[PDB]
Design a protein around this ligand. Sequence first.
Ligand SMILES: *[C@H]1O[C@H](CO)[C@@H](O[C@@H]2O[C@H](CO)[C@@H](O[C@H]3O[C@H](CO)[C@@H](O)[C@H](O)[C@@H]3O)[C@H](O)[C@H]2NC(C)=O)[C@H](O)[C@H]1NC(C)=O
Ligand SMILES: *[C@@H]1O[C@H](CO)[C@@H](O[C@@H]2O[C@H](CO)[C@@H](O)[C@H](O)[C@H]2NC(C)=O)[C@H](O)[C@H]1NC(C)=O
Ligand SMILES: OC[C@H]1O[C@](O)(CO)[C@@H](O)[C@@H]1O
Length: 537
Amino acid sequence: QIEQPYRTGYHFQPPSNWMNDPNGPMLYQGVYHFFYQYNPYAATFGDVIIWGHAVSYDLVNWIHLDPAIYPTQEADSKSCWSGSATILPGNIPAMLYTGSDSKSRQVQDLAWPKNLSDPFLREWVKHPKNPLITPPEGVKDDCFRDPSTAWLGPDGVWRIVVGGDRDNNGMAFLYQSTDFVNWKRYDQPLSSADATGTWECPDFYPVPLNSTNGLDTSVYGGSVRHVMKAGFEGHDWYTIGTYSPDRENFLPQNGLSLTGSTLDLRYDYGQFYASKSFFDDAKNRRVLWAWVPETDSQADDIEKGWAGLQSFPRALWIDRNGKQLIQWPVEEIEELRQNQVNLQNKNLKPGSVLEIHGIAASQADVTISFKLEGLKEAEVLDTTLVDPQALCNERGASSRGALGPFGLLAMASKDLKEQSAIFFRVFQNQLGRYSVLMCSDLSRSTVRSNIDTTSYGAFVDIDPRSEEISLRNLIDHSIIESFGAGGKTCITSRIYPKFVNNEEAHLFVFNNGTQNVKISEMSAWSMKNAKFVVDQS
Ligand SMILES: *[C@H]1O[C@H](CO)[C@@H](O[C@@H]2O[C@H](CO)[C@@H](O[C@H]3O[C@H](CO)[C@@H](O)[C@H](O)[C@@H]3O)[C@H](O)[C@H]2NC(C)=O)[C@H](O)[C@H]1NC(C)=O
Ligand SMILES: *[C@@H]1O[C@H](CO)[C@@H](O[C@@H]2O[C@H](CO)[C@@H](O)[C@H](O)[C@H]2NC(C)=O)[C@H](O)[C@H]1NC(C)=O
Ligand SMILES: OC[C@H]1O[C@](O)(CO)[C@@H](O)[C@@H]1O
């Protein structure tokens, strides 16, 4: 028997209880600070939510501290919800968050560390004038929240966006300030979308064109584009565009308004929400954090005593083509790699299954690259309007095609009674153009009941003719993070196989298509546990 077989070995999560939205991430005085929505009283959401707090020197190993922000004034007496961190000139980290006041309305509050001598910034003080911002005119009291990190314009004026909606229309309310204390709502929103519901945890930042690095939130220029990210209808969406501080205008590169359709982009196409990013000026990279909800039942959560994970922090940058964002786990994770098992120039005949031996199958980093032969044999299927998720749910690992399904079988039992299949399929339209589909088939991930086993999928923007299809998988017990084509397509999965309570997990490479595929190269590393020290009470 294993105790708590679903807890991760190297993903961030509190000692126990409920955790959701990541909060105020930042790098200050050489220390990485991480905060998060936390319920100290249960493994479910509750009436009292506070900011958990942990620190790290590498974004991998953490030290749990006491909660940093918790109700202490009328402006946040009922709860301290999501917010962001902004380090102001003079080296002072300023935290803006949404509080639930005594009248139960969402208002924006300010707080900053009370002792900058403390490397861990344990104590925080709140501004006497909170709330600093209250719901605009035609906005309901429970539809105005999640202030972003601020950016300083050339005119020396700070800008931030706050989520919410006006008549069910998603909003990124724009506010300005020079002292960071007195904010004035700009006439028009920075951006918005019809009938999307409340825009949660908006994030607005710049990315450098033709560069795989990150930028400080206040950078601007012709060689820079901006990303407008917002969570709604259950997912985190984003759009790349141009920002004009002068007239506070954001113009979508594709001229579209978010609709939450297959027309829009997402960071991750699986369980990924309330994502928030921060700039790391030490490594010159933008790091992204995201809450990964549980997909088991509430009863299961209460029973196992905890709920909620954070995705592994990943570097974020814009693709060479400037049409989408790329994600990749921060290099520090590589230090967890132990022994390695490799494979090269290996053919996977139709309907075959190859087991990877000598790896801790429940906690590993697996990378594989496929070399395809005879693309012309690809099934004909125009995918212009096709919904990749629907397609993956319709055709799992048991649905045999020409090119596909071929990929990985993670968190699988010896008998394969339970398995999580991350694979690819290749199609072509009538004109002979190819398209690639990436799937996370969770249909057979567990034999347990009351487990959301919905599958996730997305199309990968690569040309199968000139580049091999690559796939990286972060396997960590109840979570699997899949990165297709170097990070062009990301899918996070939560799985709860039953076998984990008795026998060990297994790892496999498979090809259930009728066509042959080859593994040019495959690398698998056992990942040692990340350290989590508690320094509370
Ligand atoms: C991909 O290759 C096979 C394509 O179908 C798939 O087979 C699965 O296992 C057997 C093999 O024919 C069949 O199972 C059927 O019968 C059992 C009887 O107990 C049912 O429980 C199943 O639901 C199903 O009706 C099916 O053909 C198929 N069934 C499933 C989903 O297990 C392989 O499993 C696939 N290989 C991989 C690695 O996924
Ligand atoms: C502000 O932070 C500093 C640094 O953490 C605190 O100083 C430490 O205090 C502990 C307990 O009193 C000592 O064991 C350490 O040796 C101190 N180190 C330093 C840097 O002097 C300081 O106490 C904090 N201020 C308050 C009011 O708590
Ligand atoms: O915990 C409450 C917080 O969580 C969210 O609903 C998103 O998951 C935020 O919009 C809010 O600030």
